[PDB]
């Protein structure tokens, strides 16, 4: 009925992505970080710069997809830690060094499109899932408290990557616990509670995936 992975050690502190369109990269390492806690008990910050700089299927600071980062981490035979490959908030030449590898992955799985009960099962059974939402409405961006629900939110306008780190219910309203990449000043300490079982509100279950480890 309720899980919150922040209290379980599956979630690293809230990051600020800056003036680079790298939410996909942050969502991607968050999912990876969760599977490393589950698989090995330890986790550390993995490297979003590594992904922006080296995932050429993507547009670097100009945008990208999580599954693509997951494919890269597999074909590359790893991703560096943050400590090895720090975040500069802009693209440069790929400078992946194998000596700083901190995660590998065996592929990924995608949540069946639109299926919120499948996303709850994934979140319960796997852990933090990378998700895509419509994050363009002004009401999203100025969120501070409660459970977000805006019927103008468009499931056919997926534009931003976040990371589902739990689910539950606040004063009667069913929600997802969502982790953003806009600083611990955004939202409620960097997090947003989004509407759950309110018809795939904002597209939350439309392009969701996790890495295999
Ligand atoms: C550039 C800003 C950036 N968004 C993306 O990198 C991005 C762009 C398009 C997009 O999806 C476009 C799409 C999805 C499905 C069908 C057709 N088109 C997706 C996502 F969420 F769906 F995975 C993301 Cl992350 C992000 O929000 C930020 N850094 O702040």
UniProtKB/Swiss-Prot annotation:
Highest taxon of source: Eukaryota
GO molecular-function terms, A-Z: collagen binding; cysteine-type endopeptidase activity; cysteine-type peptidase activity; fibronectin binding; proteoglycan binding; serine-type endopeptidase activity
Biological process (GO), any one: mitophagy
Catalytic activity as recorded in UniProt: Broad proteolytic activity. With small-molecule substrates and inhibitors, the major determinant of specificity is P2, which is preferably Leu, Met > Phe, and not Arg
Broad enzyme group: hydrolase
Record's GO cellular component terms: apical plasma membrane; endolysosome lumen; external side of plasma membrane; extracellular region; extracellular space; intracellular membrane-bounded organelle; lysosomal lumen; lysosome
Topology class, membrane: Peripheral membrane protein
Location in or out of the cell: Lysosome; Secreted; Apical cell membrane
Entry's EC annotation: 3.4.22.38
This protein's UniProt keywords: Cell membrane, Disease variant, Disulfide bond, Glycoprotein, Hydrolase, Lysosome, Membrane, Protease, Secreted, Signal, Thiol protease, Zymogen
Tissue: Predominantly expressed in osteoclasts (bones). Expressed in thyroid epithelial cells.
Disulfide pattern: 20-61, 54-94, 153-202
Clinical condition linked: Pycnodysostosis: A rare autosomal recessive bone disorder characterized by deformity of the skull, maxilla and phalanges, osteosclerosis, and fragility of bone.
Protein name, entry field: Cathepsin K
Part of the whole protein covered: 121 to 329 of 329
